[PDB]
Design a protein around this ligand. Sequence first.
Ligand SMILES: Cc1c2c(n3c1CCN(C(=O)[C@H](C)N)C[C@@H](C)[C@H](C)Nc1cc-3ccc1C(N)=O)CC(C)(C)CC2=O
Length: 208
Amino acid sequence: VETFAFQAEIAQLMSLIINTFYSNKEIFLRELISNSSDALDKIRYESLTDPSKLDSGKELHINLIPNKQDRTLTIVDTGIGMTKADLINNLGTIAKSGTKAFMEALQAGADISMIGQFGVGFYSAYLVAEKVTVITKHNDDEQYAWESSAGGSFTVRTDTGEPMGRGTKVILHLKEDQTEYLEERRIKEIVKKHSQFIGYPITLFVEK
Ligand SMILES: Cc1c2c(n3c1CCN(C(=O)[C@H](C)N)C[C@@H](C)[C@H](C)Nc1cc-3ccc1C(N)=O)CC(C)(C)CC2=O
C-alpha cells in the first residue's frame, strides 16, 4: 500500500467541500454518473478504431448499488477505466487548474452545484461520503484500488478483490447522517431529476 499527498489545491478543495454549509448534497450522484458516462464514451470511441479493446467486456452500462448493511453506495461502470499513472498523478495534475478556478468562482458567488463545470465533480463525493474507494481496471494496466478519507492523503494498492474486466467502481462509505442515499425512492428521484438523459443504461439495484 502506497500513501500519497494530494496536490495542495485538491486538499484545499476537499476541505471546502467537507466544511462548507451546503444542503443540496444530492448533486454528487449526477457528477459520478457523468464521470462514468464520459468513461463509457471514451471506450466506445477507442473501440471503433480497435475492436479488441472490448475483449474485456462489450456491455457499456452503469449500475447503482446501495448496501444498507455496509452503509455504501457504489457506482459501477464498464467504461475505459484508469491506469495507475492516471490515479496517482495525471488526473489530479490536470484537475489543479479547474480546482483553482472553482474555488475562485465560489468566492465570486457561484455555488457548489457548479463544480462539474470545473472538471472536479468527482470530489463532490465528499459531500456525502466519509471515505471513497475507487476500484478501476484499464485495458493497459492492472486493477487498482484508490482510497481517501480526505485529511490530505490518499492510498493506492493493487486490488486483489474480484476482477472487473474493465471499468471503474466508486464506493461511497456514507456519512452517518447521509443514509437517505441508500433509499430506492431517493436514488430514483435524483437520477430522474439530474441524469435522465444519460446515454447508457443505468440500473438501480435493490436490496435483498
Ligand atoms: C479529476 C478526476 C479524478 C477522478 N476522476 C476524475 C475525472 C477525470 N476525467 C475528466 O474530468 C474528463 C476528461 N472530463 C476523465 C474521466 C472520465 C476518467 C476516464 N474516468 C474517471 C475519472 C474520475 C472518476 C471516475 C472515472 C470513471 N468512472 O471512469 C478519480 C480520481 C483519479 C481518484 C481523483 C480525481 O482527481
